[PDB]
């Protein structure tokens, strides 16, 4: 695809959200799209920046042998774009691959950086790399674009990106072997792939938390989620 300008004409330079395909996840379906690879080298991308979005993820995964399946921990700066909520998810199943590569072309991005591979810790909004822009639009368009978007940010991200959780439990891995318990305040609940996004779970942190709660301190709650319970 050389066209006339592919050779050296300037291109700029931000990540775009994959959710434009109507994509949403129950959590494991996101990992369904990635898994791990393979001893093939990792690749990275340099950006001017990337898109803010309501849905992103923080990760740590473990191996039963104590390795524990860690994704690489790169020396790149690890701040990331605002995201209304993120889901930290953690624990085994194991990484047979030596890294958590995307299968979708889903670059994982933070701090104007992205990669073909998921790294330990900081959030990975997923996306594709924009290329285009008049070379001088940087003094104009970029004032609202993510490079200066913090300048034009509203105060509503305080109700926005602030509203997040880290409590998912990734038991097992792959489509034939995993479960996602959700912790609250050392309480757990049966995974609900038929429900999405922690606002729902927040009700559990305001209702079943209010009653049907772990008044019994013998252990973390394991709420039994009956489909009737899910319904009501």
């Amino acid at each position: 695809c050389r066209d006339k300008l592919s050779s050296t004409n300037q291109l700029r330079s931000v990540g775009l959200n994959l959710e434009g395909n109507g994509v949403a996840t129950d959590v494991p379906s996101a990992t369904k799209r990635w898994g791990f690879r393979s001893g093939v080298p990792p690749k990275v991308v340099n950006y001017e920046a990337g898109e803010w979005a309501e849905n992103c993820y923080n990760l740590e995964i473990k191996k039963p042998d104590g390795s524990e399946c860690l994704p690489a921990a790169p020396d790149g700066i690890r701040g990331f774009p605002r995201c209304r909520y993120v889901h930290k998810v953690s624990g085994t199943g194991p990484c047979a691959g030596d890294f958590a590569f995307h299968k979708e072309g889903a670059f994982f991005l933070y701090d104007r950086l992205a990669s073909t591979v998921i790294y330990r810790g900081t959030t990975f909004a997923e996306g594709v790399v924009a290329f285009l822009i008049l070379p001088q639009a940087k003094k104009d368009f970029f004032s609202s674009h993510p490079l200066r978007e913090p300048v034009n940010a509203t105060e509503d991200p305080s109700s926005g990106y602030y509203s997040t959780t880290i409590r998912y439990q990734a038991t097992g891995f792959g489509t034939n072997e995993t479960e996602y318990l959700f912790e609250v305040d050392n309480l757990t609940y049966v995974q609900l792939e038929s429900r999405f996004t922690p606002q729902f779970l927040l009700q559990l942190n305001e209702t079943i938390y209010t009653s049907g709660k772990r008044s019994n301190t013998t252990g973390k709650l394991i709420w039994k989620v009956n489909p009737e319970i899910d319904t009501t």
Partner: antibody
Framework: DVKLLESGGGLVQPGGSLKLSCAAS??????????VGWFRQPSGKGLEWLAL???????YYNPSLKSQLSISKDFSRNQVFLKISNVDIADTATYYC??????????????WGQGTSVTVS | DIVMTQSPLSLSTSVGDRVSLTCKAS??????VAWYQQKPGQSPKLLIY???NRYTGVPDRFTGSGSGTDFTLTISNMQSEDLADYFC?????????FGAGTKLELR
Amino acid sequence: DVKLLESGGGLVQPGGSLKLSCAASGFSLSTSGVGVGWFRQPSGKGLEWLALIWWDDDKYYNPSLKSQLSISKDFSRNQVFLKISNVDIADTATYYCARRDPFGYDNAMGYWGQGTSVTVS
Amino acid sequence: DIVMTQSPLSLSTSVGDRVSLTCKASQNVGTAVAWYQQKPGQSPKLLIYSASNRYTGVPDRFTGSGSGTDFTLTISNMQSEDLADYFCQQYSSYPLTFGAGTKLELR
């Protein structure tokens, strides 16, 4: 029937260390089923240590005792370990770990396993 | 955090005596307790789920009773083979503790 198993073990010089351990034959160790109980001293006197072991959180029943102990586990094999150090001679026992299936939040961990013989000299 | 007591080890029985056991605690546990028994030379087995429910394979002589700082164990009848050291526990705090074991003499 899962067999809780015990290994250790045997004679230890006082002020020494021992990685005391157990295993669950025939068991699928997983986050399901919560966790495992931990060794209690059969010597008596009476009851001693239990551990609040959760698949994601080893917790200490009586943290003051951590000067001699710490806990870790293996999921590749159904195994759990105790990092005994600075041994007190008063603690010798055959030590029973136990793993009752949890009753959800009611983690009533009975189901005692095999004995071992911890001794010192 | 919480401490517990149990009726004394030295109790005496004869076959077919209905008996009961008690324990006490320094905190109102609600129903978060369990009872178990053990026989010498043997690993222990659990007896009472919660404040009253019983574990699988427990004899029909046994149910739990009470709440809070006071619990009991009802045992209908007696059999000499059923002697064991009996115990109870709060689950409301850590470290967890057991009441002193008790057993009854065949006298």
